[model samples]
Target chain A: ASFGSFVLDAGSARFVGSDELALVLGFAPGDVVLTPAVVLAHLHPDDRLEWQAGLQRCLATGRPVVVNHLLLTAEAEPRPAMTTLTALTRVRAVTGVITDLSDRVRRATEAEIRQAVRAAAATRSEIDQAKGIVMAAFDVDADQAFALLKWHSSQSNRKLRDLATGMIEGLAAANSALPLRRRLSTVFTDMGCPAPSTKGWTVPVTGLPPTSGLIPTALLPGILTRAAHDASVAITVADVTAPDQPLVYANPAFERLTGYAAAEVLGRNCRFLQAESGDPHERSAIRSAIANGDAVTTLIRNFRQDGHAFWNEFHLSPVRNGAGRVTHYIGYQLDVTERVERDQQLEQLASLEHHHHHH
Target chain B: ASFGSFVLDAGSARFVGSDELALVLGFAPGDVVLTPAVVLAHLHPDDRLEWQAGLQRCLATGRPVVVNHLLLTAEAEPRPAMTTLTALTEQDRVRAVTGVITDLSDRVRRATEAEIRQAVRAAAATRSEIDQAKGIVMAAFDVDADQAFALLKWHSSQSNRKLRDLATGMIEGLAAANSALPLRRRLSTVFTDMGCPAPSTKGWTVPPPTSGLIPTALLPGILTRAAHDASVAITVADVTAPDQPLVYANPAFERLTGYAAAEVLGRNCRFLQAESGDPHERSAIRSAIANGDAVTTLIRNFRQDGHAFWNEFHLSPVRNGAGRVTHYIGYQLDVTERVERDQQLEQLASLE
Candidate 1:
């Protein structure tokens, strides 16, 4: 998060570092003259060899050498560090910049894990939905349907999810005047099913029964709404036309995020979530955008129902009707507490580094 | 690739910028005095409204405003640009403003929010499909997730085909087999027909092409294309192999080293070192390589015709998934002029 510079006198085998550099090495400024052995003692045993090799390379070639290693503090704590050594051939010295990377490395690793977990969760949900559709279409038990799906998947050398997805899409497409039997015949044929085997599967054309009828045409809209409801990020809709911009709808994810039931949060202003935590400027900006029906994004601190604070990346966009009147405002909320915390930590480290330099 | 800084005077409405700023705006240094109108004319019309709104917000709140927009050059070219404007407040009034404009045209354009969402959805779909296929393999062979995945990978490599394609084919075959049977029949026949004997995990290493060369597998298509188009000479050596032979040499390297990739690949790079080069430098390079460290060095080297020049060599080790050294990427630059300039400066200092 912070860099410290130093110059090594090659002839004297001594290092003279800036105040910040001394602090970076866990030393008071000008407390003691730094020799090669003293500096090597401060580095992790595993990194000292590379450090010495890089120094020799720089001194011999008069070019910069960079190495990523760990620095051992007096307290026995090891911090990840990157050092760049540049040779000053004319001055018989080597200049270098050493940066601490403990926070950065941890932040990067956490982000990667978070992304993988989120992707896996989303994928699992999709596969579950596909399975449900297969069970309905084949009139089979859940286990039997899964087995049949897997059998087809293994035979075709195709993914089970892909086969399930194809079946779902095929059902959606079959919501037409065509007889249910006719549609099943076409699908079975495409799936490499024998024509004679699928001929017996049928549904009554007149006064269709509840158990064995064509998939209703109205199913597509419900599926789409369910997809929105299942989104990972929280979502809410506010009736802008109403006074105080009351919340009209909140998805299940939104409720889970805020620890509030949909019925309890409905018809109430969402600003209650801020609970005297948000910055005045951010609140003002949001108010101004809403008044003008303009889209805006802001990061604000909000407290959950249990009083736990979170940093929310909130985006609000206006929904307009045919006459261009602002009818509603859709809000998208993503929790970015880790990112904000990382940024604040980095800023504090930078200011600490800057303080040492000026002193 | 570059940044330009400017300060706008609130009272006089005049703009003052660094020389680099002038170059970025396609203007000669001090050629013309910059005013609000001159600057606004250089911005794309679609971006002007947002720029103005951001400016108003920054001034009113004394907060920094960051906006990404397009800059119109004098040659009628549109370049992607990001500008960060910070208000300089004196007491309650905003007196001055500082802005840093960065040229983002060199980097690939970022996908829109909707596009990114769609991409993530597609990627998740692919992952789920693979997972479902793994489930099928597990059900048929009674293997765990890892074993199922390995078996799938083995078959994919054995057939030299995509794993997804093989999974699709096997599933469709099962479907056909099921349809060919009576309604009451179980799927045992289909599984028996499609299943293969479980492969032994012992000594069943993935082929080198599918090995954990993360960058080699992920970046060759795009990164290789970048290396081909790069101005700097680049080469990659296989450190896992004996003698650390060169595996790749970019076109720029071919032009700089005066050797074709065909002639240099599978050969150690020491051939470039001149006989007169310092032994200490050579030993230092050897030590760096032995330590698996990144190093930049300048040494005298010869081209194909034995013409000597100062070679600025940078070497960095690339590690595999297991954190083992797998390759070494070397960047070569001809810095003879720079080395000569330093020598001339040293001579002058000595004379003084």
Candidate 2:
């Protein structure tokens, strides 16, 4: 690299100037000296932009620069100079400099060497931060933690590199358990929330694989069941088809919902449970679900085996695979029928509505 | 509005049947009638969803939904109605709805008159509560009232609720304000924040928009700035750059910082008479200013006329902006020059 031939050292008024040198930056027996401020000021004005960029990345990624041949004028001439920088310490301000690249390979090798050391020192930071992010979001092992990173990348339509960068930032600033604790405290502060740790936390492991473990196509129902148990509101999954809808997965709360258990209603078409004829909301919602995989919430008069009408709370899905193919649709169902009907009679259907005025 | 004239009459058994509604729905008003349940069953399945939606909105908004002169199942026939409902009181569950079939023109005339009066009262009340709520938050965050409003709105967006309802909930839960639902939503949006079990924290007061910022509060701030023309200096007002010309002088602040108010006022303030002199004052001030808060600086500097002196002073932003020195503020004093002049002119426009 051209940048390796000329180097500047701190507290010394000299440029270790040489055209054929393997280690010009090393403070050795005899290196030429130059006026300190004069040499620094001689750097190409335009090259400062790229120099700053290199400086930033060295600080952030702990990677030394591998810049190609460029030029900088000597004190009297208008010429560009090739340059490269290597992080001298893990901290932002400490870095090594190489000026002039008469031999590309020699200079390139020096750049590589500098980066390798920084990377070795930086690995603990990068990996540990990634581990923390995964631990915070999902309770999983190291491999699984990385997988969540991959998952977030794919979902957000961003690159894996970018997501990793975000994790580093979010992790560095994060108090680990603070967010969850804050959320809990925020929601139930009066009710009281558990304390949080400054360092991150990990969720207890369930049966899922931590990293790159393929999801069991059939175990979705079980996954949803477990997930629901952890959620605040009841969680249910339904299967919507062209002709009718079925209750694919419902938690124990489902029984508390529509007077039917997952066992009694698993394969049954939800339409059959609707009243003989009362609510056309079902017709419209079915169209909406199939048309857009949209979540639909409407009052449809469904029926129980005892001929009692129930309102089914259905969440339809456009369940698809990695290739974007729609598969067997599943729904998370809840029985809001009775509540819906009663709330209507009282003209009060909003779950948040209170008779007393807030103000 | 058409439902306004309907009354809650307690007539139990003399109900019309659903079949009768079909006749009236088909246009023969005199020959048609409808049973409540049957008519409910015959409700346009399309309309049933609408009813559910209307019911929800009314409940959530705490507004009465009145539909008067509404057509029943009168086939092709068109007739008006005067309807009213007595909703269930907290202690009662038997809500009654009643309506006298009537002419449309009369009902419309009554509805228009009622809406005008009702709307004004509702509007005045809601506007006042929201403003008061903003004031409470402003005091809590020690920020401008507008930024306080932005915090309220940001919480509403995160919670996916109506702005009014979220604001109202805060009012009701102000006693347990830290535990309000809106607070939860607000905390979640601090994308970097891992919510509580705060570290050694008994609890942290929910940070208002006036504290730190999450560009996420962009929308909320915009809404607040537009509705209320406040300085919107929640996060930006750091270091108390409220554009005031005086360095604050609290009792202790004066003790630590050497420059007294007389020597400091109308001065850019980062300059205090400190021990060292020449070429370092600018860097020290810049470093402190960059920290973005009212901070204490203990460094060396030269007095205005080049006397070497040592000064240690603190500067702070105004707590809540009543439109004075409020962007952010810093404090300093020339103690080397002012120790003997606590009562002298040390320089006083006041004495002059």
Candidate 3:
């Protein structure tokens, strides 16, 4: 590739350039007029728009334009070049230069190489994090600890990143007696979380991953379970496809609120908890919400196992997978009996005020 | 827009498809042989690598691959489509691929046009809010609208809240802070407001210290900026006392709740509620403060003139240099009107 320069007459569309420049534009000195269209035709298709736009802008403002584009020779061979265009209103012409940049492009490939190095460094750090946790818990060397992470990854049909994250979370969740090594309470007694190590833990590691955003996909169910347990509200997950939508899982709060143990309630439909005094309107609201797969909050009168009445302020939300298919209905309930009673009293007083003002 | 499917024999790199699919791949029935290279020749140059990489992953995992890509015809006509690829494997080898391509141009354009309309409305409302907030500041402080904007920008930096959030907080009449700016810092702002340039000429050139930024080693300087520049009333309380007592109040505090330092300092913030503060909000504030945890409460409070108004304030513990919880910082915002506005907007939206 070699440098080329040319001048194009705006009105006559005449080209004035050396034979080398004409050859670069796919023409010999006498073969073509080398108008702007003729010059743009030799440029790569991707570069044509910018070439046209640049010259147009230059013509409008009487300012020079500079751009890098790939140009083609008479044989249609591509070469990288730095092109500059200057407008001459007095001459009514555009003068430009193309400097071959093929040499710089060859060395600029280092950018991609640098990117690969960064990705490898990140993978190395993640692997090291998982290995250190394993070595401390199992009293093993780096080699043995690393093999354990790979083994888990291969067996779980997951990438190493996922397995490494799961191992860290498993230890955090277990707090003591890690399945990898038993009775290792010394590992994390001071640190508040699952699975233990023989030696007091270093690495200043937290017991769990952050609950939201960057949460590991494998740990999502556990996080949701933990959240349900920690909440004051009664929470239940019903398998909507199952007969009558039996309760597949209910948090401890739900069991306590309803006076029903997991054994007594797991296979039972939640409607069984509703008493004869239940409002038809409340039931219909829940029915429609479920039927349409819409999220809804409704207050229903429900009975505990001992036949005590409570206002259940329950919210039903649909959970969907990535394909947008509904898979489960997660329900949250709060005992709002006292709140309802107070609201009723307020309403009664408002009614009296209304009558006193009108009558 | 049109749709088609293709099957690829991974071992041979051969493509088999219907006439419609062949046309999409830049071919007529008699003009082309559909090889992987031939099919790829019609794809946009920028998308070929991702297309190949996606199929490569499908081979490695035998999992269904889904991708959206732009394809180019031999004549360089661009078509956007959603493509799904499912693998057919023999033992560990992915022998074939089955793919479905859906035309997405009309749907994508319609969705984008709808989104642009909604976005414009949201943008208009945001512009309106800033204007509303500016009006409020001007009316309350006797400043012109231009001066009000300068104050909003100053408050925006000091509070570490976006300028829009600060505006929203103002229009809503919510206390944006529960803590007060320190006295020396407040004096600097007062001096600057009086046309005396900052004592340190470098302060303007260098960014002014603002809250929620990376902590500066110069903590006292940052404290002064927070005290003087914040739009919200910020107060600091000494929590080590049996009853946490107010230790500092910024100028905004004096403006918001109408209390002077002499009347407010060493007094519990509970006095702002007089006897009218909602009990639940106060109880929540008390227990959370005792535990050194942070909380936000919206409740009724009495001003210096004994007029009741809604107060929304956030409280968080600030550790001393010793790492002891010696002070609690609070941000007070007035949110009475904004809440009403939100209700009205929601009601209108529901009706429509």
Candidate 4:
């Protein structure tokens, strides 16, 4: 836990050290002449090159060298250590401090392992969902779908995950409830068919045969539903045609946010989530926007199922059918409690500091 | 780029600091008598409690305190900084404490909650891409999930490419190839086939074909051939089974373990571990499986011939919908020589 300091006269190839420095290099004070050769002898063979290079760089550029390596003790026991060397260029000398880092390295390695494991798990999950999308779209078995995906990847030179993400986002953006043939044609067009040519291969045309029936209409809704279900933000649909604009649909994320299941909240007004002390102005603005059939975004106080308050920043958009009449209202909600609380705390602190200055 | 050091006489509540420390605290040297109060005044109000607690903990336990906090400078601008405090404790009472402070304003920047949320969403969006790529590979090759991953991994290794990159490229290539095609015309064809009136494509424009590479029809065959020819041993374990059992093994796996796929298909991989293998390594593997995590370990394993060799084993979980671990794909490499060399290095380090 202690650091050893030493000064090396580069020109003379001699070293001067504190008593602690002798202990660090596994030598008795005055028992051995301290020199570059003696110091290199105490360094692990694997680290000797790095030490020499670092020292040379420091001497040449007058820049400090901070390196981690293994040091051999008097008993030849190897231990992890870090050295910080700074050059006194004018005097042609180098001063450095060495500290043992065995405990720190072990803790850091353990933390890195845990982090890698978590990252792997997350990456796998994303790839899985993307595969599900492709599987449903192409009507191919898992392995065949993967081959096709790989073939396309090899041809395009894009990362597999990026392509998968793009496909998922593309599907979500397209009409989720499009007719089976239309969706199939769209997907096929997006994934053009390959044909061999004199030069190499080309996509002569896009679009699939309607009769191919690669994607059934029944599966169309499921794909869109999955997209909504897996989304991080809360989503809900309110039927504007229904009396009092009752809640007709809510994704699982909405349930998680409010601690209320979709079934329990259906046919009820979403206003129940509004806190009793919520801002009236924001509520009025929302109502006015809804009456005018216009989209609006607002941050307002809302209560969860457990009566805990949260700042809900939500966007409400009108959904129109083919006839151009607003059929339903879709809401995207996010909990902004932490941001709001931090902002308030900073404001309070600033005010308190101002008061202290005045006094 | 520079660190400021200070020595605090805790008994007298006084502070002696280097000239660099004065510059770091937004004060000129000798302008102010540095005291505990003067130092606390420069700390951000939000981080004052954390600074006090870290100092107290270091004083009590003689442990070094490393803490990150915001410091309010002379201009009242808050900047991030990290301080490491070490108490020089002697005879049961601390006489002095030394601290080293480094500015971290450049490295540690605050991110808004919205930015954090967007980052999370972006990361989440990418996860399903790999899964989809795996599924495509599975369907294309008529292979199970594990076999599909193994094939992908083999191709990835042979090409010296990242697995994610390969998967992304495959999916992107297909989409990119069709970028020049008209979506309206495609939709019109669908409607006509459905016997419904086709929508007008009067304004639709089909751009000239942007050059794109298309994989040959024989690509699947080539990829499958590579998987079979890979030299690294690979296996897949079905974790959903009563006892996680091996479901697939590659040709190289058979050669390395000296056990045919037929002999190992339903047995647990633990059978391959040597009797004297490190219990800690085994436990680490077990914990990773139970937690649905990925882990890499070097353990001693005995082949069917009863000869022990060091195996560099990597196991990653494959989860189904709802994120439940359904299978584990394991990649093994014979690292006996490397392991022995490391052992010899350790021995040499301990020799005279």
Candidate 5:
């Protein structure tokens, strides 16, 4: 017969005295009690510390605990189990039968093991799908593509699953191969030999010496429309080894935004913006992030398929799969020329206002 | 005494030897000396292998062996002094003996060290000048000045000087900050509230004005002057640097060539001629001549520099001071307008 009361949810475990433990085994709430030392001896060596940390967390947070059955069965077998536990109002108030949780603790351990395996499998599936998205969609020779996905996830401040989901949707939405073409045009021009211009591609005043290859946004509409009426720049892959960044690809929008023909973009790295300076040099910040496979979002001054330069705000992400391996990366860019200008203007205005107020 | 043989020249080094080994020690023709390996060890260490290579080359060519004494002992410390050995040739045989030379291994070592130090110091000076130029460019743009430097670099190449040379001149020609006030006044209407700074005098001098001196004229006048001055001409070449040229001239000079400024600038000086062209007849032919065929009689012609030129019977060879033009040979003609026109073309198409 007992002091405190309880409503034990089914499939859950809770602490009890020898009498209550006996009640769980068909006896009354209190017949005989077990010492606290007796309960301590029954704990499986591995679960003891985790149990303590878990108990402490529950108590501090005032959360309820639930645990499933696990057993060291005198038969010596570890079995499938799920157990969760949360702290109660005050386990300290009970006297005499201090530690009688021995039987319940064993059941909890065996159950938890099964749940962990199932979770791990589900995680691996999403990660693998994300890797495929990089490989098939962007043509990133596998390893580099995974790296890209991982990089993007980290950069977006998102979980790998969420990032993978975003990437798949983004790739599907943009329509693959479009972005690749756009970026590659700059590369082709930089490298001096480009494939013949694709259909719908226009080359007005690209009269720069064959060596003066700079792709800017001004050349897009015609080049991209030639490929497909509907195209999206999903996977924009850049060759890491090239000296100058030439576009590896450009979809319809990338073409529209970057204004480069397909062949003119493929063989190069994005460094095609070098024509603006004539002394083609590396833009260090952009290069370093790409090299380290970091996910970054910043305004970069990149070139168009034409020779014009513009400011682009882009979400650069490196993709990695379940095995925690990175593949090729993908960058989603938005032209921020007007936006950056607006920001600069507003900042200046604010400064002026502050100065006026001070006076 | 060695058998009678050949002789060695003062300007050129040679071996007065009879055969392969004998010929190496300045042994000339008709000599009969067969030096043993121990005797061969007398050759400077630095020169030994090279002397051996020369012997090999001579043997291959079926010519007598010879090598430059200076090249062999130029920087060798403890170098074995070289000597002339002549062999005597009798009615049927030849015999040889050793000759003479002044010891100079110690002096050569000191000279080489001095040369190395001088080169290093020059390199450092050039580097500092480039850094200063980059700083000036950065301050002007208010952004990463390396971009501005691209243009500067393009200018340097177009102007033809080491980047350091261009940078040094830029640092030299800087002017006082106050000078910008005048330009501000001139641009007041256009800018409404502000104007561009005037060209400064700070880096206005080539070879930068020495310690306490200020540059009075940094850019040559040919760039900013009017078209009427008959005697006016300017050149912006890297005086000591090779090949890159930026020369300009006025209408008065153009009148002499019967050509427009557009046609003359940007092209190599070789284009100003009407017929055959040549590169070897340059004035220093006498100081150092490389093979024969130094005349322009076999090349093609170009008049894009506006007027044309034809030089026949052109033999250009002479010696002069280092800083002076080597010969009194006519420029054949002074085609400043032709050069100016080329410069103007280059200036228009190339925007670094």
Candidate 6:
């Protein structure tokens, strides 16, 4: 049902095939007695000339040729078919089978697309981690960090992802305890790339062309925020520039622990959730520590939207720019109400035993 | 018409078959009417009883069975046939299934010969030890291995037993009379522990060397005799070493090659090479040694005294575990006298 066969004699101009082939071609039994030219007229104009020439050439050399082309159906509709032409030298003719290929081609293309998408996703992840390593070790932005990785990749003749995979595992860092600047200089000399001079790495990052088509680093924060929502620990960033140091970003874990929507908490000081019976000394410790722009951790009483109180264990670290000014305070929080209550009960029993001994 | 077909009704005790089955059972088409008793009368006496018990138990359980037995013609001729019986059921009632009986007289005749051919083919491998035993038999009884095999076959037929059993006993007998076995073959055996016992004139029969010895059984004596022999200076070199250093040498090394055991132990065998040698022959030996193969070559090798001696030696690689050649065994013969005479003979022939 999906294929047809035929043999054509160039000398006699007779087209011969099984009755099924003639039926599939929508030919009346009487009209089935046709010439090879009549059959070629059913092919698409583009395929008609291309295969007609190829078939004639193959016949001249007594060879066989296979080609995939668009064939016009009985009602002049275009369909994709693979046609194979085999030459019969003694008979001066060509015979072949034509099979439908539309569905098979569609499936092959879909599989190729899926594989490319998966590979692109993996490459994006590795490149991000590579930039993270370089950024942390050399204190550079994503652009400069990626540029140095490319330079090293060019020197070693290794695929960019292979070098990044090695570096992401911290094997590269463990190789030499020397400081980052000395390490780069030595690596450059050994691997035969552009040498980073001892006078210091005076090479400019902008001059090096980008290696491959890389998804830009601007998408990193979006991906990082999406991944952080799945983490258990609350990840929040407080913008110190705004009044009251309002929370600029808070992950889903923060909402679960404090019972405040991200929109509701924005532009509001965390002091609003503090309870009346909360420890003031710890509160003052956090305030003075933030004012000094230093890192600190504190335990204090806080209330949820339903007015239930829970002990919050929070740590805040100030992230600085090159000038050493704190731009944001990154807060990590955990709800430790169960541990605090158990510890308080134990302390109360120990104090009661002391009072009983005195009596 | 290699087969016949039939249908039998268990309840009515009536049998219906195609014409061929009636003809095979020695009845004309209309005359063949087989009730259970009539069918049982055609079965061989022993087959009738054997199949009677088996078929009844099978049919009572409503299971299918295939049985081969001798079917008798009207003249009381036994014909081999394979009959397959299957129980038929219609609506939980026992019934008869159409079965086909195949005549197998021709196939049975062919199969008997095929089985014997297979056994004979299997005999060739067992024949290895038998042949080895035969060689030892020939050395002791002064006959060939083939004649020994013929004698063993004859003994088997006369004794009404297997040929391998007779061959085994003959090998045990010759093994006890070991001295009559050739000295070179015995040297592969007991002479090692006895360590060159000066060709014992005592005329004692040495028992066969512990029966069809394999490589490991012969390795100890092989190494011992080579290590102690006065004429041949055998050397074993570690092929795995970078320089392929010599690891072994016999006492006769100092006498023939003029190199002491200690002097040559840690050096390459090439140390015995003269300034004169054939590159073609040397490469052949090197190639064979590298591949763990064996090669015999005659190359000019100088003694430690700097006098050239043509050495004719056979070198083969000794494999360790994993079949890797860890060492090379070189057994050398002094060929200087033979080469000088060959040169003289060539000169005289050319002049004549």
Which candidate gets the maximum TM-score versus the true structure? 4
lDDT per residue (tens digit) for residues B1-352 in model 4: 3455667766886677766666778877778776656667878877778888978887777555666566786666677565666565579777766666656554432444564455556555555366666655543323345655665565455445677865665555434333332322222232233343433211110101211111233222222322333345656676777788876666768888898766788778988864554566666667778887666766667788886566777676655557665676677777654453343234334443
Estimate, for each residue in B33-117, the C-alpha lDDT of model 5 and write its tens digit: 4333323464555666765565444334422232324313224424323222222223433322222232222222122445444
How do these models rank on TM-score, best leading? Answer: 4, 1, 3, 6, 2, 5
Give the C-alpha miss distance for residue A324 in model 6, angstroms. 37
- List DockQ for all candidates: 0.01, 0.00, 0.01, 0.05, 0.00, 0.00
Model 6, which residues run further than 4 Å from truth? A7-38, A45-70, A73-82, A85-95, A100-125, A138-359, B1-352
What lDDT tens digits, residue by residue, belong to model 3 across residues A1-359? Answer: 24556666677857666555676555676887655677677778899999888776766664545565777765556866655555554547766655454443443344334445455454544555565544433333345555655555654577877665555444445533223232222222223233221111111101111112222333333322333433334667676767787776676678898998766777677887775554566566667778677866666667888986666777666655446665567676777654454344344345556888998
Shift in Å, residue B204, candidate 1: 73
Which regions in candidate 3 have their CA more than 4 angstroms from the true location? A1-211, A357-359, B1-352
Give the clash count for each candidate. Answer: 23, 95, 32, 40, 127, 3
Every candidate's lDDT: 0.59, 0.37, 0.56, 0.59, 0.36, 0.54
lDDT of 2 by residue, A1-359 (tens): 22233333333423444433333332332453432233344455565566657645655664434332234443443432333343323332322334332343233334444545454334434443444334322323345445544555564565655555564444334444333323212222122222221111111111111110121323322222232332222334444442355545454544555566656666566555554554455465465555664434444445566675444555443444346544334444545533343233233212224434552
lDDT of 1 by residue, B270-311 (tens): 888645546666678778887888777776777887665667
Model 2: docking quality category: incorrect
lDDT of 6 by residue, A157-199 (tens): 8778876665544434334443333343344445454543111
For this target, which candidate reaches the highest lDDT against the unseen true structure? 1
lDDT tens string, model 6, B1-352?
4555566676875677667666656777678565456656777877777566645644565444445567787655566655545455556655654444555444332224454444444443344234333333322222233443454454455455565655455444334435543322332233222222222111101101121111332223222321332234556676777778876676656677888776676677877775555566556666777777666767677787776556777665554446665666666777553454354234334444
Docking class of 1: incorrect
Question: lDDT at A80 for candidate 5?
Answer: 22
For each of the candidates, what fraction of the native contacts does it recover? Answer: 0.00, 0.00, 0.00, 0.11, 0.00, 0.00
C-alpha lDDT (0 to 100) for residue B122 of candidate 3: 48
For candidate 4, what's the RMSD?
A: 29.9
How good is the docking of model 6, by CAPRI class?
incorrect
